């Protein structure tokens, strides 16, 4: 619990754990890991309706603080709204849902998943097609707003927003709450630079996922693209801390000050990442890592790539 200060007061751990993960993992397995994690350090703890893992993230959570280990007070749990819900009166319905499956009274952080707004109903993936739907965001941000004034959501962000689309929220009128963060993919070789930097300029926080360079879910990942683990100048790095190619992504965030997610559902690994605040890198690994930027979004799908809202200028 290093922590930054959020532009709504709040506080947000500067590293977090990922929970998510592919359909073909047993659900059961995101309650062994997350309460792996809890008691590994991490407090900052990412979720999203899209998951289909809320109630065994949650459960785990709980039992976190059944057993003493920690208070509600102590975890940062956010969760996402998803692409089918972005119609306003949609949006804290969509939340409570997220409440309830989590057996929480209120998430610490509330996103927006992405921009790109899909056809209202229950399939995640609405043949189908994929169907997509055309939504002012604005009008689901001012529900959003409303999730906060509520106290559903202590903090309200959002996901995977370009600099235009953060733009149209920050300049819309009657503004009543800035996006406390915007959740990007963002590693050594897709770096976010320029969005960075205009975050910093508007006290909005960027969180990086993919940190590690993704899971490579063959669904949305070319398998041909670089590993970003396997990367010389990352393995060099780690050679020379005597740490470990992730450890060296994760800590390259923290020093650009990026607050980091970091998936895991390997008691090892989970435990070794929480290694991040235990190591510095130098001005010249810093400016060896920036070297590395080369425009790579491992989410890379004919599937969403043609989507109006898409925010990648490819
Ligand atoms: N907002 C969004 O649209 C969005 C998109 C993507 C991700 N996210 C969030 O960000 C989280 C992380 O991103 P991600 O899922 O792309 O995964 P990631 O953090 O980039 O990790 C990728 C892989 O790295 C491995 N790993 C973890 N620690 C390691 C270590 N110390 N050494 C070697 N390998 C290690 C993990 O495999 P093992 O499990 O086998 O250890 C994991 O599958 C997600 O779980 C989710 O919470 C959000
Ligand atoms: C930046 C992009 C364009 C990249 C793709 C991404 C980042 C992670 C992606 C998901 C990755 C996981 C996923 C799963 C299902 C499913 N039905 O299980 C359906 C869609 C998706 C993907 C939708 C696009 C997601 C949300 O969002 C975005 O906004």
């Not at 993919?185 to 630079?193: D, I, L, Q």
């Not at 949305?220 to 050679?239: G, I, T, Y």
């Amino acid at each position: 619990q290093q922590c930054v200060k959020l532009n709504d007061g709040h506080f947000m751990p500067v590293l977090g754990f990922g929970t998510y993960a592919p359909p073909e993992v047993p659900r059961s397995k995101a309650l062994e890991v997350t309460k792996l994690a809890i008691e590994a350090g991490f407090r900052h703890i990412d979720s999203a309706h899209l998951y289909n893992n809320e109630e065994q993230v949650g459960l785990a959570i709980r039992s976190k603080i059944a057993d003493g280990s920690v208070k509600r007070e102590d975890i940062f749990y956010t969760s996402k709204l998803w692409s089918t819900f972005h119609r306003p009166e949609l949006v804290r319905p969509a939340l409570e849902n997220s409440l309830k499956k989590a057996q929480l009274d209120y998430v610490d952080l509330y996103l927006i998943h992405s921009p790109m707004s899909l056809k209202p109903g229950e399939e995640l993936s609405p043949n189908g097609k994929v169907i997509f739907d055309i939504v002012d965001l604005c009008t689901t941000w001012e529900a959003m707003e409303k999730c906060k004034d509520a106290g559903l959501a202590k903090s309200i962000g959002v996901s995977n927003f370009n600099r235009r689309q953060l733009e149209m929220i920050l300049n819309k009128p009657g503004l009543k709450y800035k996006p406390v963060c915007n959740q990007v993919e963002c590693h050594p070789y897709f770096n976010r630079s320029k969005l960075l930097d205009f975050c910093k300029s508007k006290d909005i926080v960027l969180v990086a996922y993919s940190a590690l360079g993704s899971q490579r879910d063959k669904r949305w990942v070319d398998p041909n693209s670089p590993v970003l683990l396997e990367d010389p100048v990352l393995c060099a790095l780690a050679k020379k801390h005597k740490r470990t190619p992730a450890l060296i992504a994760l800590r390259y965030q923290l020093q650009r000050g990026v607050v980091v997610l970091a998936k895991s559902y390997n008691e090892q690994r989970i435990r070794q990442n929480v290694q991040v605040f235990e190591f510095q890198l130098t001005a010249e690994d810093m400016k060896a890592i920036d070297g590395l930027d080369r425009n790579l979004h491992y989410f890379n799908s004919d599937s969403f790539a043609s989507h109006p809202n898409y925010p990648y200028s490819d």
